[PDB]
Structure formats: structure tokens, C-alpha cells
């Protein structure tokens, strides 16, 4: 009987109008926790919004899109729960305007295209992105941080951001898109589908 601990816990995202954002939460515990977004106590209910679970419901993605300003700007609030206890944590969001970008924010300057591979085979999505700080990558496919280490070495990014599938399966396929983020904010590229045939 472990309460719930969170694994990846969320972080404040400066957003741009129009665009998308993304909170990540998962906990840990025994027996397994249960994961869930809110704002200010009522729960997330709008039509722009989304929550994907993963890990059996321990892990949940906030998705917004598109992102408006003022009214997205929030605080909101990941809770991880089981039979032990709670525990929460939050995640603010700030959403600026095109006009209202620092030069340092992110920018893909070329992002992901379509991409069709033939199972057991290499595909490489590509893309590049700039900023100040440089940004780091980071790929999502189907809404979902892509995890390198649940691959089993058939994927990894490469150094330079684009992301390498070794021997791919049908299981690869679907919705890619590059995240772009530094102290500036994060930017979204434009969604590209990876097909396996
Ligand atoms: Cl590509
Ligand atoms: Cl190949
Ligand atoms: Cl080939």
C-alpha cells in the first residue's frame, strides 16, 4: 500500500494563440493510482480541451487547441488517487499572441511531412525548429509524448531532432507532430501522418 507519487509531473507553458499546448501527469503508487486534470476545482469541460489517458489511466495529456487568450489562461490541476491517499500538483498556461512573441520563441522552421514505410523498415521524420535558447524536441504521436525507452531501442531522436523508427510496425502508425520549447515557450508543428503498410 504505496499512496500515489508523481512520474513526469507537468510544467507552466507559454503558448501561442491559435496554437497548441500540452500538460503531461503521471503518478505511480500501489494499489495503481489514477490520474485526472481539473481547473479550480470544477473539471475540464470545454469543447477545445482534451485528456488522453495512458498507463492504465496513472497518466493522463492535457491537450488544448486551438490555444485562446485570455480566456485558456489558467492554472490547472493534475490529481493522482488510490486506496493509500491523494496528491496534486499543477501547471500554469500562458498564451501570448503572434504579435506578442519574443524573438527566442520557438519556430519550426520546417516540420514533419507525410511518410508512408514498409513494416521491419526505417522511417525518419524530420524537423527542424529555432530559437533562443535553441529548443529541444519533442515528438508526440497521437496526442502522446513519444517514449524512446517503451520502444525497446527501435526508436530514439537523433541529434539532430529528428526522429528515428528502426524496423517499424503497424503499432507506429499515426498522427506525428514536433514539439518545439525553451524558456521562450513551446510552438507545435503542423500534424503529419506516418502510414506502415
Ligand atoms: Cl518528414
Ligand atoms: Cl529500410
Ligand atoms: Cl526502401
Not at 509531473?9 to 494499489?31: L, N, R
Not at 497518466?59 to 488510490?82: F, K, M, S
Not at 527542424?128 to 519533442?138: M, V
Amino acid at each position: 500500500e504505496e499512496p500515489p507519487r508523481f512520474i513526469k509531473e507537468p510544467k507552466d507553458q507559454i503558448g501561442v494563440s491559435g496554437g497548441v499546448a500540452s500538460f503531461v501527469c503521471q503518478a505511480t503508487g500501489d494499489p495503481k493510482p489514477r490520474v485526472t486534470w481539473n481547473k479550480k476545482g470544477k473539471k475540464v469541460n470545454s469543447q477545445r480541451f482534451e485528456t488522453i489517458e495512458f498507463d492504465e489511466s496513472a497518466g493522463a495529456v492535457l491537450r488544448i487547441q486551438p490555444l485562446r487568450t485570455p480566456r485558456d489562461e489558467n492554472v490547472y490541476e493534475c490529481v493522482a488517487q488510490n486506496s493509500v491517499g491523494e496528491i496534486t500538483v499543477h501547471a500554469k498556461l500562458t498564451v501570448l499572441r503572434e504579435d506578442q512573441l519574443p524573438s527566442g520563441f520557438p519556430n519550426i522552421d520546417m516540420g514533419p511531412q507525410l511518410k508512408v514505410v514498409e513494416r521491419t523498415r526505417t522511417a525518419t521524420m524530420l524537423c527542424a525548429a529555432s530559437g533562443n535558447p535553441d529548443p529541444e524536441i519533442t515528438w508526440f504521436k497521437d496526442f502522446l509524448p513519444v517514449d524512446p525507452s517503451a520502444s525497446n531501442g527501435r526508436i530514439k531522436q537523433l541529434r539532430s531532432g529528428a526522429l528515428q523508427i528502426e524496423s517499424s510496425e503497424e503499432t507506429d502508425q499515426g498522427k506525428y507532430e514536433c514539439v518545439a520549447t525553451n524558456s521562450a515557450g513551446v510552438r507545435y508543428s503542423s500534424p503529419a501522418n506516418l502510414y506502415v503498410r
